Amino acid sequence: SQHFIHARQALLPDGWAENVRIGIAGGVICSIETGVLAGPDDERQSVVVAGMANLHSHAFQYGMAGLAERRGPSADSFWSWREIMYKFALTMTPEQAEAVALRLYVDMLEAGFTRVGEFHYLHHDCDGTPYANLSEMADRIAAAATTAGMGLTLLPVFYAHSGFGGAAANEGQRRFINDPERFARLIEGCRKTLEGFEGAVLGVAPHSLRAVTPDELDSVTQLLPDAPVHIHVAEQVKEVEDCIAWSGKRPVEWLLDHQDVTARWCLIHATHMSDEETKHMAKAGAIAGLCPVTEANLGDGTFNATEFAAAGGKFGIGSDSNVLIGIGDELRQLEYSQRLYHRARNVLAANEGSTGRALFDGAVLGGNIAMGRPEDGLKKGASADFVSLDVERLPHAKGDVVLDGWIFAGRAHVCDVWVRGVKQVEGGRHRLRDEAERAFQKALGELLA
């Protein structure tokens, strides 16, 4: 039946409003009324904001979080990360993958993310042979999301090569590999699995320009022409240099010249762009899939955030390596990367407004577009996906001040979280945290033994 949340303040697309009654029916927002008293059966909340998309995740990497911070003996300071990543990637079973993904999605839900964009490349069995059920590993993701009550935009990854110009994939990549034919069949397995997964979106994820040839890129991005396309691009300086050596062009530039890039596309990282690439990307409408915590943890670089925003570019955030899960963590890192690079404060604020406000609104907006859910948000007809904040330490704080306290000062935290109208998180706790954790610790023990 029809259920009501009454919020003392709620951040709607046209701004903060007070005394907001949000009606929910069949998991959808059926009504929003501002300046009204709570009905006697309304559930009362202090501060309500939209659910955040987590637009880029590799669920299995959550298992290695905190384990890649030892330097090791290599001259290459990235060796330890790849060694740990491939130890997990090459041994994880489907049962383990479901357990890890579940506990990750619980952590994301508890942090206020209501949908995940799972950029999924862990496909085949340990020897690189397909599972009897081709989409087995994607089915585990979907099962994990279903159990969590987490929204899912599933983005199976196309990966065939180890370098520019169609270099053969090496044996370490064997569980990731498909040709376009076997990839289409995998996408078909995913579509069947997602039947009855309410709100699910199925797109495609060419891994990167290194990993895919131009012809393969054409085939993959034509499979589901109305659904999202995600791709890693321009994350590390070495890729830009290699791309130039191969084509005479930088990665984003090359992509914009060879594909019809639109808001259908989400370019993950896009960390190293010229001013011209930044503008063209924004003008094309491609969403920047920013992963600020992972980019810092990997030493990738700093995004051209002010230029991108000034050109009308839109963005979202993704936990990516899943080393550390938090909306405040990601947005704060984005802003602070800018403050250090430009020697300035409140860099990503819009007009003379709040930096937390601009970042939060922006990341919700661009995130939902990248997820294929532009109808979503705190709007009539959107999925009933939203978050209440604990403002016990900010008792008189009016809207934007709440966001800045949350994101910069640690003075608020996520309280309740709803997805499709179902309260998955209460007072910061997911209804299945402890059960998910027990299964996660069992899987970790197996993987690390």
User: Does residue 342 have an active-site annotation?
Assistant: no
Count of CA atoms in the C-beta half-sphere (13 A) of 65: 23
Q: Is 107 in the site for Fe ion (CB under 5 A)?
A: no
The answer on whether 58 is annotated among ligand-binding residues is yes
Closer CB to Fe ion, residue 323 or residue 402?
Answer: 323
Q: Report the partner that residue 73 touches, choosing among a second copy, Fe ion, none (CB closer than 5 to 8 A by kind).
A: a second copy
Q: Does 253 bind Fe ion (CB under 5 A)?
A: no
**Element housing 152 (H / E):** strand 151-158
Virtual CA dihedral for 100, 101, 102, 105, nearest 10 degrees?
130
| Shortest CB 81 distance to a second copy, Å | 6
Partner whose footprint covers residue 10, from Fe ion, a second copy, none (CB < 5 to 8 Å by kind): none
Instruction: Give least dist CB 420 to a second copy, A.
Output: 27
Residue 323 burial (CB < 10 Å; 0-12/13-18/19+)? buried
Nearest distance in Å: CB 132, a second copy: 34
Q: Shortest Cβ distance from residue 92 to a second copy (Å)?
A: 18
φ/ψ of residue 34, rounded to 5: -110, 155
CA distance 348 to 85: 33
Closer Cβ to a second copy, 16 or 159, answer by number: 16
Backbone angles phi, psi at 167, to 5 degrees: -50, 140
Give per-residue burial for 156-177: e unless 16+ CB within 10 Å, then b.
Answer: bbbbbbbebebeebeeebbbbb
Q: What does the binding site for a second copy look like in residue numbers (CB under 8 A)? A: 65-73, 77-78, 80-81, 236-237, 295-302, 323-326, 333, 336-337, 339-340, 342-347, 349, 351-356, 393-396, 400-401, 404-405, 407-411, 437, 441, 445, 448
Closest approach of a second copy to the CB of residue 367, in Å:
21
Does the annotation place 56 within a ligand binding site? Answer: yes
CA distances from residue 109 to 115, 134, 139, 236, 416 in whole angstroms, order as listed: 8, 29, 20, 30, 9
Choice between 228 and 301, CB closer to a second copy: 301
Catalytically annotated residue among 107, 300, 320, 385: 320
Provide the 3-class DSSP secondary structure of residue 268: strand
Partner that binds at residue 376, options Fe ion, a second copy, none, CB closer than 5 to 8 Å by kind: none
Query: Could you say which of Fe ion, a second copy, none residue 290 binds, taking C-beta under 5 to 8 angstroms by partner kind?
Result: none
Q: Is 330 in the site for Fe ion (CB under 5 A)?
A: no
Number of residues counted as binding Fe ion (CB under 5 A):
1
Within 288-327, which residues bind Fe ion (CB under 5 A)?
Answer: 320
Q: With contact defined as beta carbons under 8 Å apart, do 218 and 402 qualify?
A: no
Q: Is the dihedral of CA 353, 355, 357, 358 positive or negative?
A: positive
Instruction: Decide: residue 38, CB within 10 A, 0-12 exposed, 13-18 middle, 19+ buried.
Output: middle
The two three-digit tokens of residue 171, written as one number: 């044996």
The answer to the question of residue 139 lying near Fe ion (CB under 5 A) is no
Which one of a second copy, Fe ion, none is in contact with 320 (Cβ closer than 5 to 8 A by kind)? Answer: Fe ion
280 is in an annotated binding site: no
6 carries an active-site annotation? no
Place of tokens 């009539």: 380
> Smaller CB distance to a second copy: residue 34 or 77?
77
Tell which residue, 298, 299, 250, has the closest CA to residue 278.
Answer: 250
Least CB distance to a second copy at residue 134 (A): 33
Which active-site residues does the annotation give? 269, 320
Residue ranges at the known binding site for Fe(3+): 56, 58, 232, 320
